C-alpha cells in the first residue's frame, strides 16, 4: 500500500507551500479517484507520490511505477515501440492492450498500417490519438502502481466509456494491480474504492464511498541579393590589389640584381597603392556579407509567415528551426571570413 503521513512541500528551495498536511493510505488492488477543483494539487500529489518531488517534512512509502502524465509525449520511434517501451513483445499482450485502447481502427487508417514513424512530438497525430497512445504505453507495462493523470481529456463519451470499461475495470483489475486515476466524470465514481477530495492544496474529506456519504536555383538569388554592383566591385578590387602586389615584387627583383630615383618613386607609389586597394577590398567584403545576411533573414521570415497550415503540419518543425538557427549563424559569422 502507498502510505503518506504529514505531506508538506513547495516548488522552490524556500517559499510558501501548496502541499500542506496530506495523509493518505492506498491499499493494493484498489481504485482511487482523486477529485477537486482546478488547481488543487492533484497532479502535484501524483508527482510527490512519484518521489520526483521529495517533500520538505513528511513520510511517504511504497519501485518502477508506470505513469501517463497530464501532457503526453511520444518518442522518435514507431507506434509499436512507443507502446513497448524497451519491453519484449508479446503476441496476446500487445493485441489486448491495443484492442482495449480504442486505437486499432485509427492505427490501421494511418498511411503505414503500423510502425508509422511518429513525427516530432506527434504532429502527424491527432489530439486524442496521442493521449490514447500514452495510456496504452502506461497500461501495457508490467508494474504494481499505475498513475493516470486525466486520461480522458481528449476523448469523447463513447471512447471514454469503452476505455474505462475494458482497460481499467477488466484488464487492470484482472491482475489486481493498483490504480490511481485522477479525472472528473460520472461513470467512474461508483466503480472506485477510495475518493480523495482536494481543495487549495488540502484534502477536504477522506475515505471510501459510504463513509464519505455519511460524513459532513541557389547561388543565383544569393549573388543577386549580394548586389550586381557590390560583388563586382569586390572581385575587381581583389584582382587589382593582387596585380599591384605581383608587379611591385617583379619590379623590385629586376631592380635589386643591378634611374635610381625613378625606381625609388615607383616603389614608394606602389607601396601606397597596395594598401589603398587592400583596404577597399576588405571594406567591400564586409559590406557584402552584412547585406546577404539581412536580406536572407527578412525573406525567410515572410516566406514562413505566408505559409498555409497544411505546410506547417506536414513539415517536421525540428528541421525548420535547426535549419533556421544553424544556417543563419553560419551565414552571419562563417561566410565572410
Amino acid at each position: 500500500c502507498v502510505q503518506i503521513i504529514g505531506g508538506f512541500f513547495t516548488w522552490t528551495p524556500d517559499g510558501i507551500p501548496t502541499l500542506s498536511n496530506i495523509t493518505i493510505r492506498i491499499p493494493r488492488g484498489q481504485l482511487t479517484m482523486i477529485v477537486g477543483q482546478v488547481g488543487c494539487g492533484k497532479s502535484s500529489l501524483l508527482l510527490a507520490t512519484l518521489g520526483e518531488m521529495q517533500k520538505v517534512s513528511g513520510a511517504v512509502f511504497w519501485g518502477p511505477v508506470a505513469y501517463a502524465s497530464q501532457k503526453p509525449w511520444l518518442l522518435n520511434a514507431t507506434v509499436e515501440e512507443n507502446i513497448t517501451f524497451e519491453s519484449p513483445f508479446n503476441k496476446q499482450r500487445y493485441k489486448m492492450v491495443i484492442e482495449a485502447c480504442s486505437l486499432q481502427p485509427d492505427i490501421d487508417i494511418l498511411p503505414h498500417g503500423d510502425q508509422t514513424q511518429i513525427g516530432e512530438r506527434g504532429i502527424n497525430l491527432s489530439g486524442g490519438q496521442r493521449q490514447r497512445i500514452s495510456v496504452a504505453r502506461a497500461l501495457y507495462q508490467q508494474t504494481n502502481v499505475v498513475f493516470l493523470d486525466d486520461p480522458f481529456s481528449a476523448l469523447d463519451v463513447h471512447l471514454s466509456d469503452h476505455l474505462m470499461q475494458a482497460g481499467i475495470l477488466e484488464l487492470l483489475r484482472d491482475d489486481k494491480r493498483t490504480v490511481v486515476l485522477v479525472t472528473h466524470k460520472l461513470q467512474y465514481l461508483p466503480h472506485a474504492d477510495w475518493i480523495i477530495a482536494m481543495k487549495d492544496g488540502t484534502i477536504q474529506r477522506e475515505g471510501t464511498l459510504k463513509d464519505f456519504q455519511r460524513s459532513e536555383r541557389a547561388c543565383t538569388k544569393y549573388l543577386s541579393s549580394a548586389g550586381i554592383l557590390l560583388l563586382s566591385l569586390l572581385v575587381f578590387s581583389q584582382l587589382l590589389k593582387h596585380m599591384v602586389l605581383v608587379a611591385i615584387d617583379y619590379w623590385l627583383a629586376k631592380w635589386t640584381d643591378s634611374d635610381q630615383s625613378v625606381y625609388a618613386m615607383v616603389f614608394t607609389l606602389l607601396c601606397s597603392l597596395g594598401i589603398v586597394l587592400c583596404l577597399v577590398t576588405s571594406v567591400t567584403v564586409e559590406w557584402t556579407g552584412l547585406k546577404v545576411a539581412k536580406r536572407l533573414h527578412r525573406s525567410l521570415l515572410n516566406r514562413i509567415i505566408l505559409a498555409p497550415m497544411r505546410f506547417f503540419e506536414t513539415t517536421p518543425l525540428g528541421s525548420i528551426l535547426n535549419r533556421f538557427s544553424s544556417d543563419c549563424n553560419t551565414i552571419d559569422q562563417h561566410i565572410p571570413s
Binding site: 482546478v38 488547481g39 469523447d156 538569388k221 505566408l306 535549419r323 544556417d327 562563417h334
Partner: protein, 290 residues
C-alpha cells in the same frame, strides 16, 4: 612564390571545401524559401463595418485536408439565425474540428458556399476574415512573457478592462494571488498554470476580442463539471447579443442550446425543440446519451 604557394595550396583547398559546405547550407535555405505556395490574401465589403447580425448559412459544403485525398465533410447544409446559441455534437472523427477549421478557411480543398449576412469571400481578403470571428481551441497554447502579452499582444486595453475580463472568466482569484498581478512572468506552458487555467486564459482572449461570432471547440476539455456549468452560465449571460457555436463532449452544455446539430459519419442533421429533438430520433442519439 614557390615556397609561398606550397603552403597556400593546402590552405586554399581547405578554404574551398569550407565554402562548398557553407554554400550547400545557403542552398538548403533557398530550397526552403520557395515552397509554401502563395496562399496569400488578395475593397467593397471592407469599407463597410463587419455586420453584427450573426445570420450565417453554409450550403453544400465539403472539405478535404490534403488535395486529392478522402473527403472529411460531405453535403453539409446548415443555417443559423442572428444572435442565437448553436450547439454541435458528434463522435470522434465526425468532423467538428474540421467544421471549425473550414469556417476560417484553414482547409484548402473545400467545396460549397459560406454566406455571412449576404457576404462571403468573393470580395474579401483573408485578413478581414481573420478579424470577423473568435475561436477557442481544444489545444491551449500560451507563449512566454507577461499576462498582458498573453491576454492582449496588441497592448490596446486598459487594466480595468482586463480585470473585468478575468473576473468574468472565473480567473480573478488565482490572478490576485501571484506576485505582479498583471505582470507575472509566464513561461511557455510550464506549471505556472494547469491545463484548466490555460483553457481559461484562451477563454479570456475570446472575451476581450469582442467579435460577433464565437467558436468554442471543447472549452470543457480540462475544466471541472462543477465549475464548468456555472462558467457556461456566466459566459451565456455575458455573450448574449452574439452568435456562439459550441462543440463540447459534455451533455448538459449541448442540452442548454436551442439549435443543435449532430454530425454523422460524414454529414449532419439539425434539430431545435428540446422536447421534439429527443423523441424524434426514437431516443437514440440525443436522449439515451443524456
Amino acid at each position: 612564390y614557390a615556397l609561398m604557394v606550397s603552403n597556400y595550396l593546402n590552405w586554399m583547398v581547405r578554404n574551398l571545401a569550407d565554402m562548398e559546405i557553407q554554400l550547400g547550407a545557403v542552398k538548403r535555405i533557398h530550397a526552403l524559401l520557395k515552397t509554401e505556395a502563395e496562399s496569400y490574401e488578395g475593397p467593397s465589403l471592407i469599407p463597410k463595418n463587419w455586420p453584427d447580425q450573426g445570420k450565417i448559412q453554409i450550403q453544400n459544403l465539403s472539405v478535404r485536408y490534403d488535395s486529392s485525398l478522402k473527403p472529411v465533410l460531405k453535403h453539409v447544409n446548415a443555417l443559423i439565425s442572428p444572435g442565437q446559441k448553436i450547439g454541435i455534437c458528434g463522435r470522434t472523427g465526425s468532423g467538428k474540428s474540421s467544421f471549425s477549421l473550414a469556417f476560417f478557411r484553414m482547409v484548402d480543398m473545400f467545396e460549397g458556399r459560406i454566406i455571412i449576412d449576404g457576404i462571403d469571400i468573393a470580395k474579401l481578403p483573408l485578413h478581414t476574415l481573420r478579424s470577423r470571428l473568435s475561436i477557442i481551441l481544444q489545444d491551449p497554447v500560451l507563449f512566454s512573457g507577461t499576462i498582458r502579452f498573453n491576454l492582449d499582444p496588441e497592448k490596446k486595453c486598459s487594466d480595468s478592462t482586463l480585470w473585468e475580463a478575468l473576473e468574468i472568466a472565473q480567473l480573478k482569484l488565482v490572478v490576485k494571488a501571484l506576485p505582479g498581478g498583471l505582470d507575472a512572468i509566464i513561461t511557455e506552458g510550464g506549471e505556472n498554470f494547469s491545463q484548466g487555467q490555460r483553457q481559461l486564459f484562451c477563454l479570456a482572449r475570446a472575451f476581450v476580442r469582442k467579435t460577433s461570432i464565437f467558436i468554442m471547440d471543447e472549452a470543457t476539455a480540462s475544466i471541472d463539471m462543477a465549475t464548468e456549468n456555472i462558467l457556461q452560465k456566466v459566459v451565456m449571460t455575458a455573450f448574449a447579443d452574439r452568435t456562439v457555436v459550441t462543440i463540447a463532449h459534455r451533455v448538459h452544455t449541448i442540452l442548454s442550446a436551442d439549435l443543435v446539430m449532430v454530425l454523422k459519419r460524414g454529414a449532419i442533421l439539425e434539430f431545435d425543440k428540446p422536447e421534439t429533438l429527443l423523441s424524434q430520433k426514437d431516443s437514440v442519439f440525443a436522449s439515451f446519451v443524456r
